[PDB]
From a paper:
Through single-particle analysis, we obtained near-atomic resolution maps of DNA-filled and empty virions, enabling us to assemble full atomic models of the virus pre- and post-DNA release, including all structural protein components. The full atomic structure revealed that the virus has a length of 1350 Å and an icosahedral head with a diameter of ~600 Å. The tail has a length of 560 Å and terminates into a baseplate with three radiating TFs of ~190 Å in length.
The empty structure corresponds to a postinfection state. Compared to its DNA-filled counterpart, the empty virus lacks the tape measure protein (TMP), baseplate hub (BPH), and tail fibers (TFs), indicating that these parts are jettisoned during DNA ejection. However, the length of the tail tube remains unaltered, demonstrating that it does not contract during DNA ejection, similar to siphoviruses that infect bacteria. (C) Structure of the tail of the empty virus. The dsDNA, TMP, and baseplate are missing. Otherwise, the portal and the components of the tail tube are unchanged in width, length, and conformation, indicating a rigid structure. In the empty virus, the TMP and TDS are absent, demonstrating that they are released during DNA ejection. Genome release in HFTV1 triggers structural changes in the distal tail region, including BPH detachment and TF dissociation.
Author numbering:
A (entry chain Pf), B (entry chain AQ), C (entry chain AP), D (entry chain AR), E (entry chain Pa), F (entry chain AO), ...: 2 to 157
């Protein structure tokens, strides 16, 4: 229903973009991007623009055998979402928001999503890394896992 | 007939009911749910043949076993109280509390929706406390239903 | 003669049939399959000798054990219904459902293909729900076939 | 009603009382605590139906099991002494020491506080020394309470 | 049949090259190469040319003893297939294609392939590595494993 | 006498014979082989002494247990057929198939070569299928021989 | 009364004494020491009530399980010799050697000092040799005493 | 007195003797060796007291258990042959082979040398082949000695 | 003729009738039902021969014994009242209550339906209360019927 | 009429009364209770027929037997005393104490409440003491009532 994309990165982008404006804590809705939409020196928002979310798959998706039928793979998909802002409290609100938004869908039997399960499974803070002299991006992130049965065309 | 399909566990919603009223008894937070109809089997053999002459079934029940992690004060006080009552203390009477139990579970692709219902489940023992330091409490139940009252596809 | 050879488990195609109409009963998604023809053995010893004097066999049965991960509604409604019928609830009657089981499996080298076939398999107990949080459901069967109706190379 | 809820084990406060004078017997440092009211179940079956015809309960007891790490001389000298007394050696008499046990535990959310109270707990065996090199001592109790005197929300 | 290749790398090249022009998602059938067929400064397609798949064996193949006879090895092999294109949608579609191509042959009996099992076992996305400022190849991959009984010289 | 020495398991060659003809029955691909002569022991004690007065042996047999991984269609059809016949289906008769069994094993340094021979091994149960998904089938036998007919150094 | 407190195992000193003389029998090198007073419990139930009418204790003993790593030639020759003698061989007589046992253990903070004394400990079986290649020998004792003669705070 | 001391397992020298001619039977390659003199204990209790009134020992034996990795034809052909003979096949007779067993072991410091000797050890079962692919053979014995003929320090 | 066939106990329906009306008497819940027509036999022997000269029948009766677990007031009050009367207390009169009895059973494979009918069964004693702690009341009747009035296949 | 129903033994409520006063005699703690009204039957047979010509009742009594675990001084002292008197010693007189007896039980599903009453029960022997080691004293009575004075449904 809400996504039906062929790949997890676009699926999570479609879930984050589908979110109501009322379900973001800040004054304005963030902008959602594939991590490779932006060049590194441009990465993160500028001042007087809303915060930016970068989404990608950081590690290998598993394709486990489900049965002796060979009819589906138990597919486990890995994602990370980074929140970038100049506001050290906005990145924290975005982390809270992303965990909330993606805590819908948690056990879709492929209802909204093309998956059995989309879940936040961990979160990182990187605010310690932004140096204090220069204005610069604070960064925080959500780690997401995603599971489903994916067809094999073995049985025609 | 309906194509066999895998099932995502968490999509299953379990509910307990008072058989006097069909009212719900609040219960939540399952981690395992095993429901297993059984009969005793008697096989006939005689000096005529090494092979089984006949086989027959008797002593029907349904094994119900559950692991869960949300404590229910209603479910416990029902089990103490016995049929058609609640109690805050052990009751010196001969009747176990009987629960109707239903589990509704969408198939992985939504291809069908299994509704399983069990009549007159009773539990020989009930954990009230199940503490381990540095963890949340987790509780195990074993019980026995009289029979399966429904096992059907309830999609559409 | 035919040379002994290894077998890749997943190559096996397993089916159940209704022994009345010879129709297939839909079943799928096995993970383990054990078929073991057995007899009770009786041994004669007497004061004449410390060695075994005679040995004989009786009570043939075939132990059938299966682990499977796709739920079949038809298989369960057959098991509930008993011979020549299907039902949506426990039946108060003495006849268990009898399944013919056939399993066909090539050698790893393709050098033979054993067909194993078993008459009148019955299951004392049937798992209806077998849910564990964060996993797909998985189910076990244990049952007794009357005898092996076929064990031959069906290649060529 | 009161909503079912998770419980953090460590929030629980456990105490033993002498049932004569309602004085506390000093005990501390548990690691696991299990309290399980039980009954024996008798099921009636007869030739006229394969389903269970009746079920009844008898032999109430409460299984109490405790793992603990702080030794108490008072608890042990009570257990040796038997009812209404303390002793520094085994007593040749037929009355075991009977403890009232009370465990009071908040919900993880603070939404209720279950008090579980058990009369006349007795322990068949008592660990006095339980040493293992390079570790602190740890001890286990198993015992039977007569009944639950209280199971209610004691919040507010 | 479809390969009879002497080594796993050439086997997977042959399987990808045996794919019909109908079974690729893009308009143009990709070109399949060994990773060492092209030098680094010219690896990946030029513009106006079909996308490129690079095949090689990235990690140690294992030769487990199958049995006490020593007549055969339980050989397990690993392969990576990387897809290179300038089109981020095209590498995604190619990854899905490689998965649903190499999911034929999932449980051969040395029928098409010389193996018991060729399986996609995981998938990698590397699109986040491509700098956005320049034109440049996106990369995605399928990791695929292969298992079979491989003959020894011991018994001539 | 001959120096005791360690033995490399794989050096052992196991063979099965029809006792009617001394013809070989094709069987291969073992993983484990246990052959253990046994007797029951009766020890005599009386009021005159706390020490054992006598000890005696009776009920000789040889335990034979085998794990193996190459399926033999001949061996299975012999076990079905009973003495002096083969069958493709269970036989309704009282005689188990009796196998003569011989294992010949060179010592680690070639210092000796034991031949162990067991007469009239019978197996109460025979695995046919023994599938696990994503593995080759592995089969376990337990049986009992009447006596050891030979245990000697075969070397030179 | 004395505050319950944890105990560091190794601070416990264990000693054995000949009950005829109160002389020490040399023993050392314990790894585990479990001392557990026990009784058999008889619970009364009648048709009057599901609750226990009465409970009573009988058949007192103390379980004494010890694991140790220093072999004592005196302790073994006492156990052979029986009461009031030592022997270098099995004795054909009806009396087991009885050891008085005492364990003295300071509490973790020195808050108290447990002395536990057990009279007439006897051991049904004694390991003399307990070899494992590439380790020092380790010995397990199980025995039982008649009663606890002392359980007191020894401090000050 | 002699101070209790640790024992390095591998310093143990183990031997078997024929009790007729006092000749050694060649045996080697031990891995574990357990020697445990034991008695059955009978305890008297009566209505007079809850404490043990009397305890007595009877039915003495020495449990001998051995794990070993070097096969011996002499040991096996003695076990087959029975007292005062060797045989290359099972014997149909009632006398088991009786071995004297002696084990000698210095303490870790050389502060004593424990010599343990056991009369008339008998083994109910003997492993002849104990193969497992990719390993050397390992063998186990369990048997009963009549009594300990020696337990002393043989140093100096 | 009709083939012999097994009969499954639980398939039996037992009924009692008042021979004044052919009205049914409510009875239920059997567990055992034994019916045995019998005669006294007299054998003639004389000095002429060691073999039996003749044998003859007399004193026909049918032993009926039933165990059942559902109590019936109607059945008990008919037995109290005697022929053609129902009573709530012992009657001082000489006529016992005579019941007609019929038991109907399908054979295990439906080859026939055996109906046994017995006239004028009388029971010398009637268990009114048959209570055992922790069990349902189980009642055993023993009595003599006059004759078997029907024994036939009552199937289609 | 009223449907037959199971009865649960622990729902019994046995009471005794003095027939002189209708005063209750204190009695408690039953575990088994059998009540069986009976008559002697005489059957008539003659040369005219092998079947029974007549059957008649005589020598009516009610077998009462009770096993109980709580001793009663009143019950024993009434039995010693005889009718209308109480004694602390054996009385040398010819009149046995006659007890009226009543037992009441709800049926298992509450369909009826059976009351059984028996006049003039006498016990030929009374167990005063019934000590068995490690058990509560269990007492068995066997006696004969004159008649059943009542047997009815006493539910409202």
């Amino acid at each position: 229903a809400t996504t039906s994309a062929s790949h997890h990165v676009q699926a999570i982008i479609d879930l984050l973009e589908a979110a109501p404006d009322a379900d973001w804590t800040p004054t304005q809705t963030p902008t959602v991007k594939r991590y490779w939409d932006d060049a590194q020196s441009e990465r993160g928002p500028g001042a007087d623009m809303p915060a930016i979310l970068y989404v990608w798959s950081p590690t290998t998706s598993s394709l486990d055998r489900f049965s002796m039928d060979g009819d589906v793979f138990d597919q486990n998909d890995s994602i990370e979402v980074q929140a970038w802002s100049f506001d050290e409290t906005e990145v924290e609100q975005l982390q809270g928001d992303i965990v909330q938004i993606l805590s819908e869908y948690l056990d879709d039997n492929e209802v909204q999503t093309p998956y059995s399960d989309v879940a936040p499974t961990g979160t990182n803070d990187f605010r310690e890394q932004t140096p204090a002299r220069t204005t610069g991006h604070y960064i925080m992130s959500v780690e997401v896992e995603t599971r489903g049965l994916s067809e094999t065309a073995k049985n025609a | 007939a309906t194509s066999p399909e895998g099932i995502w566990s968490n999509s299953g919603a379990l509910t307990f009911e008072d058989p006097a009223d069909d009212s719900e008894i609040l219960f939540a937070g399952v981690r395992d749910v095993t429901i297993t109809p059984a009969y005793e089997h008697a096989e006939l053999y005689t000096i005529d043949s090494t092979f089984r002459d006949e086989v027959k079934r008797y002593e029907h029940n349904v094994n119900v076993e559950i692991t869960y992690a949300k404590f229910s004060l209603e479910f416990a006080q029902e089990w103490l109280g016995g049929p058609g009552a609640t109690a805050t203390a052990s009751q010196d009477d001969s009747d176990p509390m009987k629960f109707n139990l239903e589990n509704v579970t969408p198939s992985a692709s939504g291809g069908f929706e299994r509704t399983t219902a069990v009549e007159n489940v009773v539990f020989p023992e009930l954990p009230l406390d199940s503490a381990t330091y540095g963890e949340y409490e987790e509780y195990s139940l074993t019980g026995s239903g009289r029979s399966v009252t429904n096992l059907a596809d309830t999609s559409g």
